[PDB]
Ligand binder design. Sequence first.
Ligand SMILES: [Ca+2]
Ligand SMILES: [Ca+2]
Ligand SMILES: [Cl-]
Ligand code: NA
Length: 172
Amino acid sequence: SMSVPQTKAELLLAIDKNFSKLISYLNTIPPEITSDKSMDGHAKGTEMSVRDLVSYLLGWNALVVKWIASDAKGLPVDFPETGYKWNQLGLLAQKFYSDYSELSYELLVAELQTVKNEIVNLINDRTDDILYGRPWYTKWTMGRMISFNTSSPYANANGRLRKWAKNNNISL
Ligand SMILES: [Ca+2]
Ligand SMILES: [Ca+2]
Ligand SMILES: [Cl-]
Ligand code: NA
């Protein structure tokens, strides 16, 4: 649907559309301002930087790749992550923050592009039946696990960046 992809084609489209927009925004923003803690954060009342936002996106995108790739190698997978429950997603996002705290904006953007390319490759190697035809992780399809961690967060990031750019001298 327009809300949540329900086919392989829709998933690829949402990724392509939302990521193309995101990368256009990330390539526009002067890197010199990407450490200002001037964006509203995920939890209300917090603040984050553009670099921090890229770090959060990278963590979710790397995670879904790790789930799929590890499963495909016949390895057990902890969801959402080893040591975390599904009601600890803020805590998990803070792991990403620490994981990537010393990485530059430029390296983060490059890494995000790399893992986005890898998720597209994983999708391309599969079919609609694999992605949407049956459950994969408990009640959820693989395709939904992918959009939940890629196209949906990309679109949220795009909206956050549009709002922020209005107060930071950036047209986009
Ligand atoms: Ca903001
Ligand atoms: Ca505050
Ligand atoms: Cl989703
Ligand atoms: Na989906």
